[PDB]
From a paper:
Cryogenic electron microscopy reveals the overall architecture of the encapsulated dimeric NfsB within the nanoreactor environment and identifies multiple pore states in the shell. The crystal and cryo-EM structures of encapsulins from close homologs, have multiple openings in their capsid shells, including a threefold pore and an five-fold pore. These openings are thought to be the channels for the substrates and/or products of the cargo protein. The cryo-EM map in this area was ambiguous however and appears to be the superimposition of flexible states. To resolve this, the pentameric subunit was examined by 3-D classification and resulting volumes were refined using local refinement without symmetry constraints. This isolation a series of volumes that could be categorized as open, closed or uninterpretable. The open and closed particles were pooled and refined to yield complete, unambiguous maps (ESI†). The closed pore inner circle diameter in this structure was 4.62 Å. The primary drive of this is a shift in the pore forming loop (measuring 3.84 Å between the displaced His188 alpha carbon, see attached movies M1 and M2). The underlying cause of this movement is unclear and may represent an equilibrium of states when resting at cellular pH or could be a result of different packing states within the particles stacks.
Author numbering:
A (entry chain TA), B (entry chain A), C (entry chain WA): 2 to 265
The structure:
Amino acid sequence: NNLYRDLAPITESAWAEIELEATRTFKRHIAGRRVVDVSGPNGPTTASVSTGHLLDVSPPGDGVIAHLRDAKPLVRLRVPFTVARRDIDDVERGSQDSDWDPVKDAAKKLAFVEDRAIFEGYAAASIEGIRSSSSNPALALPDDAREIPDVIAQALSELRLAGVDGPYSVLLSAETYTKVSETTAHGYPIREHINRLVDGEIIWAPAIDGAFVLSTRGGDFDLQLGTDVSIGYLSHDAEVVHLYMEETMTFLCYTAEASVALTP
Amino acid sequence: NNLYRDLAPITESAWAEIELEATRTFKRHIAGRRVVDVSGPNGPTTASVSTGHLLDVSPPGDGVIAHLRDAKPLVRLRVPFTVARRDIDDVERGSQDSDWDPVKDAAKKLAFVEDRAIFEGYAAASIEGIRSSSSNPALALPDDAREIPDVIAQALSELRLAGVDGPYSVLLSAETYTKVSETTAHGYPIREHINRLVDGEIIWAPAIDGAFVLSTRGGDFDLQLGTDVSIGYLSHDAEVVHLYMEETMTFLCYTAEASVALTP
Amino acid sequence: NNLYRDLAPITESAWAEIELEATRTFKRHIAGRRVVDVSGPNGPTTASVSTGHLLDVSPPGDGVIAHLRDAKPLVRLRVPFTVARRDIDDVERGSQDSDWDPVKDAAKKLAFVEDRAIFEGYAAASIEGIRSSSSNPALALPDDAREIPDVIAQALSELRLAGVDGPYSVLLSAETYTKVSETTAHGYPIREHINRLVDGEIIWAPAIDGAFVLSTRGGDFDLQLGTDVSIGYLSHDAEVVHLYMEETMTFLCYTAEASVALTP
């Protein structure tokens, strides 16, 4: 009800088209949710996640010991966008090529923001990313792609020597993903070697910079959602309708030695 | 299990006696829980209470609007105390007059701390009390007790003129309670007049300073408990056992004009 | 009962977390138990393993022949470690990132000790390892990884010429494992060649020095356990709890020509 979608001059079919486009774009442009554990929507009443720690505070009086409970607040991210009214009206007339580019742009922006917060951190929201939280030393991606299989093999060894078990996955930036896809060593593609090195999967991650090697055993990275991605309405005009894409979330990292970062 | 009561050299009967004494003392010395609404124990995993508000924060990037969710953290209060081992051992021998004075002192201290936090506030825990949160102007208790019925009648009128309804209750400090109990006007006790003025009850509140006139309709004052009063064990010796009384709580005031403070 | 875990100030959830971490780390860091035959726990009353041989001794008197029965005693290995009490207490408050690094370190130390005893021997315990017990001549690992497939093929031939049958497995040190994983010959990875040479499996063995080629038909290597890995409690303080990881075991090698050692 807080979305006020009933006040928007948008028909049911137009809403369905917009939602389909947004879902497709967000699914295509998101990679963090494919590795970390998602704590599903807890409702609009959720404002923070309890960590279970205690913080020393001044006692209310003599002879009393006081401790505050520690919690991490959620953050709400809102990406506004605008949709032309003629495109909405053409849907009911059988139009199959309505312009939903703003929806795609908003979905891409929200997905990139979420991925960067998960992996690179968001200081204002008190989110420490996987890269900063990792304790394993960071490796460097080689200049030539033919050496990528070696470095990924060095990281895995680290994860094995730290006691971290379970399937291992590699998240590669767009440039690194393309380089690995097209590179061959004496005619032998290097993807067929990385696929054998890694028993998990290679993930298309267009939002990160370098590469990440993580252990997907479970219980190391938790994305807490208070509210999942939702589309709402602000106002409209004789020509345009103003909507927004919204999400309330936070990220927590528990295991520091379950990730290795390969810098560019 | 976190109380570690199984490691203490205390028998079941001694535990029962200690708990009975603590419960009696805390019930006798507490007055805040008789007026405000208690949100019962939510378990050890509760660290904060969501308020439903939003705080502006710096956006993660251009074209995005960010808001943090606001929450009030809980605070844990711990009052340690010590019990002699001979008194514990005498319980199994049929002793009916074991020394539980430390338990009573700890219970009184915890109850007074909780009452003062509810009514006078606790800045370090971000708790704003009923007195500071109230918007109605504060009245002054008269020098002579015979005029107390008039001032209480002035406060009620205020509560009526602000639109606040429901039963009205008066919390009186120990000195004011005794003065009202013993005072008479031309032989007519003033308690029989205050009882007719007030359709709720007169509450013995030995922790507050002056007096409070509140509306007990409901939904104005909320004491959130993460964990109720519990007794735990720290360590022991050949002569003494070290225990503590613990409670995790916070207080929230919603209706500012549902209370009037009568200063001493 | 001899572990005295009931005296420890540790809750059930903390015990579960500690045991889970220890099991994960030990499973990740152990390789001997994946090849040899494990004679399961026989109970605390087991003190030695009978070999079935006889030792000449001085007769008690004229006209009598005396022989002592030969047995190999078990050895108990204990690795103490310490855990902070605040981390234990945070588990009941919903903490998901408690510090169990000491448990991981103890598990790694115990696993490495057991692996080195199985493969390199432990003279004080009268344990002769696989390397010293082997009768086949030891080969040398080549300087360049591209020649590793050849040497492993030389060892297998030896095992075939000695009459040893059954699946063959290769245990590689961490360095050799990584080298084999990353090395390629004219773009063709050498793992795809070693996997075809060997009909068993390639085992990650971070405790051994060079490499081992063994026959896993069965009945050649026996790890006798009197008591499996178990966690016990020694004492505690106001800040820390002292625990230990314990195991009673011995190792026996029967077939001398069922193993080949490739030195670094």
